[PDB]
Amino acid sequence: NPPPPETSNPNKPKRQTNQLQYLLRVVLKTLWKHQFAWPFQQPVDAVKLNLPDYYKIIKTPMDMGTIKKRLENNYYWNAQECIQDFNTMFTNCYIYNKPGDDIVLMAEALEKLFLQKINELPT
Numbered sequence: 001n002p003p004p005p006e007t008s009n010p011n012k013p014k015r016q017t018n019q020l021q022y023l024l025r026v027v028l029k030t031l032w033k034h035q036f037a038w039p040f041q042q043p044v045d046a047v048k049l050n051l052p053d054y055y056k057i058i059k060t061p062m063d064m065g066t067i068k069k070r071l072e073n074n075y076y077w078n079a080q081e082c083i084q085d086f087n088t089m090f091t092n093c094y095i096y097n098k099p100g101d102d103i104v105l106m107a108e109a110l111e112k113l114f115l116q117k118i119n120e121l122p123t
Protein backbone atom coordinates (compact mmCIF):
# COMPACT_ATOMS: atom_id res chain seq x y z
CA ASN A 1 0.00 0.00 0.00
CA PRO A 2 1.05 3.58 -0.56
CA PRO A 3 0.75 6.09 2.24
CA PRO A 4 -2.68 7.78 2.33
CA PRO A 5 -3.23 11.08 0.51
CA GLU A 6 -2.06 14.22 2.33
CA THR A 7 -4.82 15.74 4.50
CA SER A 8 -3.19 18.56 6.47
CA ASN A 9 -0.81 21.34 5.57
CA PRO A 10 -0.32 24.14 8.12
CA ASN A 11 1.44 26.34 5.50
CA LYS A 12 -1.65 26.44 3.24
CA PRO A 13 -3.96 29.46 3.66
CA LYS A 14 -7.20 28.71 5.49
CA ARG A 15 -10.74 29.97 4.91
CA GLN A 16 -14.23 29.00 5.98
CA THR A 17 -17.00 29.33 3.42
CA ASN A 18 -20.64 28.34 3.26
CA GLN A 19 -19.89 25.89 0.43
CA LEU A 20 -17.13 24.07 2.36
CA GLN A 21 -19.25 23.93 5.53
CA TYR A 22 -22.11 22.43 3.51
CA LEU A 23 -19.75 19.89 1.92
CA LEU A 24 -18.73 18.68 5.38
CA ARG A 25 -21.96 19.07 7.34
CA VAL A 26 -24.43 17.92 4.65
CA VAL A 27 -22.76 16.17 1.71
CA LEU A 28 -20.07 14.10 3.42
CA LYS A 29 -22.36 13.37 6.37
CA THR A 30 -25.13 12.06 4.12
CA LEU A 31 -22.86 9.88 1.97
CA TRP A 32 -21.03 8.54 5.06
CA LYS A 33 -24.23 7.11 6.54
CA HIS A 34 -25.55 5.66 3.26
CA GLN A 35 -26.19 1.93 3.26
CA PHE A 36 -23.46 1.26 0.62
CA ALA A 37 -20.78 3.59 2.03
CA TRP A 38 -18.41 1.23 3.88
CA PRO A 39 -16.12 0.26 0.95
CA PHE A 40 -15.49 3.99 0.37
CA GLN A 41 -14.93 5.14 3.99
CA GLN A 42 -11.17 4.50 4.03
CA PRO A 43 -8.29 3.94 1.65
CA VAL A 44 -8.47 0.63 -0.23
CA ASP A 45 -6.24 -1.82 1.69
CA ALA A 46 -5.02 -3.75 -1.34
CA VAL A 47 -2.75 -5.99 0.75
CA LYS A 48 -5.46 -6.98 3.25
CA LEU A 49 -8.22 -7.43 0.64
CA ASN A 50 -5.95 -9.30 -1.79
CA LEU A 51 -6.03 -6.74 -4.61
CA PRO A 52 -2.33 -6.76 -5.67
CA ASP A 53 -2.96 -4.71 -8.84
CA TYR A 54 -5.11 -1.96 -7.28
CA TYR A 55 -2.32 0.61 -6.96
CA LYS A 56 -0.85 -0.46 -10.30
CA ILE A 57 -4.18 0.69 -11.81
CA ILE A 58 -5.29 3.51 -9.48
CA LYS A 59 -2.58 6.18 -9.25
CA THR A 60 -4.85 8.86 -7.74
CA PRO A 61 -6.59 7.09 -4.84
CA MET A 62 -9.30 8.87 -2.86
CA ASP A 63 -11.83 7.88 -0.20
CA MET A 64 -14.39 9.58 2.02
CA GLY A 65 -12.16 9.27 5.10
CA THR A 66 -9.51 11.34 3.34
CA ILE A 67 -12.15 13.85 2.16
CA LYS A 68 -13.49 14.23 5.72
CA LYS A 69 -9.98 14.90 7.01
CA ARG A 70 -9.24 17.39 4.25
CA LEU A 71 -12.45 19.34 5.00
CA GLU A 72 -11.88 19.30 8.78
CA ASN A 73 -8.30 20.49 8.41
CA ASN A 74 -9.26 23.29 5.99
CA TYR A 75 -7.10 21.67 3.29
CA TYR A 76 -9.38 22.94 0.51
CA TRP A 77 -9.50 26.61 -0.44
CA ASN A 78 -12.00 26.10 -3.27
CA ALA A 79 -15.13 23.93 -2.99
CA GLN A 80 -14.33 22.55 -6.46
CA GLU A 81 -11.23 20.86 -5.01
CA CYS A 82 -13.51 18.87 -2.73
CA ILE A 83 -16.04 18.14 -5.46
CA GLN A 84 -13.14 16.89 -7.63
CA ASP A 85 -12.05 14.49 -4.83
CA PHE A 86 -15.59 12.99 -4.62
CA ASN A 87 -15.57 12.60 -8.40
CA THR A 88 -12.13 10.96 -8.29
CA MET A 89 -13.43 8.44 -5.73
CA PHE A 90 -16.35 7.49 -8.01
CA THR A 91 -14.26 7.36 -11.18
CA ASN A 92 -11.60 5.21 -9.50
CA CYS A 93 -14.29 2.66 -8.74
CA TYR A 94 -15.52 2.76 -12.36
CA ILE A 95 -11.93 2.42 -13.60
CA TYR A 96 -10.83 -0.48 -11.43
CA ASN A 97 -14.06 -2.43 -11.85
CA LYS A 98 -16.24 -3.27 -14.88
CA PRO A 99 -19.59 -1.96 -16.09
CA GLY A 100 -22.48 -3.46 -14.12
CA ASP A 101 -20.32 -4.82 -11.27
CA ASP A 102 -21.93 -4.72 -7.82
CA ILE A 103 -19.42 -2.23 -6.35
CA VAL A 104 -19.95 -0.05 -9.44
CA LEU A 105 -23.72 -0.02 -8.86
CA MET A 106 -23.06 0.96 -5.22
CA ALA A 107 -20.78 3.81 -6.34
CA GLU A 108 -23.39 4.88 -8.92
CA ALA A 109 -25.99 5.10 -6.13
CA LEU A 110 -23.66 7.19 -3.96
CA GLU A 111 -22.84 9.43 -6.94
CA LYS A 112 -26.56 9.95 -7.63
CA LEU A 113 -27.09 11.00 -4.00
CA PHE A 114 -23.99 13.21 -4.19
CA LEU A 115 -25.39 15.05 -7.21
CA GLN A 116 -28.76 15.59 -5.47
CA LYS A 117 -26.95 17.21 -2.52
CA ILE A 118 -24.59 19.22 -4.78
CA ASN A 119 -27.66 20.67 -6.55
CA GLU A 120 -28.40 22.49 -3.25
CA LEU A 121 -24.85 23.85 -2.80
CA PRO A 122 -25.03 27.41 -1.36
CA THR A 123 -23.85 30.44 -3.37
Ligand SMILES: Cc1cncc(-c2cnc(N[C@@H]3C[C@H]4CC[C@H](N4)[C@H]3CCC3CCC(F)(F)CC3)c3[nH]c(=O)c(C)cc23)c1
Nearest residue numbers: 038039040042043044045049051092093094096097102103
Ligand atom coordinates in the same frame (compact mmCIF):
# COMPACT_ATOMS: atom_id res chain seq x y z
C1 LIG B 1 -15.36 -3.84 2.86
C2 LIG B 1 -14.36 -3.22 1.92
C3 LIG B 1 -13.48 -2.24 2.35
N1 LIG B 1 -12.57 -1.66 1.56
C4 LIG B 1 -12.52 -2.06 0.28
C5 LIG B 1 -13.35 -3.03 -0.26
C6 LIG B 1 -13.26 -3.45 -1.69
C7 LIG B 1 -13.21 -4.80 -2.01
N2 LIG B 1 -13.14 -5.31 -3.26
C8 LIG B 1 -13.14 -4.48 -4.31
N3 LIG B 1 -13.08 -5.02 -5.55
C9 LIG B 1 -13.16 -6.43 -5.87
C10 LIG B 1 -12.30 -6.77 -7.08
C11 LIG B 1 -12.75 -8.02 -7.84
C12 LIG B 1 -12.79 -9.27 -6.97
C13 LIG B 1 -14.20 -9.32 -6.39
C14 LIG B 1 -14.86 -8.06 -6.97
N4 LIG B 1 -14.15 -7.91 -8.25
C15 LIG B 1 -14.65 -6.82 -6.08
C16 LIG B 1 -15.44 -6.97 -4.78
C17 LIG B 1 -16.54 -5.94 -4.53
C18 LIG B 1 -17.32 -6.12 -3.22
C19 LIG B 1 -16.39 -6.40 -2.05
C20 LIG B 1 -17.14 -6.59 -0.74
C21 LIG B 1 -18.10 -5.47 -0.46
F1 LIG B 1 -18.86 -5.78 0.63
F2 LIG B 1 -17.39 -4.36 -0.08
C22 LIG B 1 -18.99 -5.12 -1.61
C23 LIG B 1 -18.19 -4.91 -2.90
C24 LIG B 1 -13.18 -3.09 -4.07
N5 LIG B 1 -13.17 -2.22 -5.15
C25 LIG B 1 -13.22 -0.88 -5.07
O1 LIG B 1 -13.19 -0.22 -6.12
C26 LIG B 1 -13.28 -0.30 -3.74
C27 LIG B 1 -13.33 1.20 -3.61
C28 LIG B 1 -13.30 -1.12 -2.66
C29 LIG B 1 -13.25 -2.55 -2.77
C30 LIG B 1 -14.28 -3.60 0.60
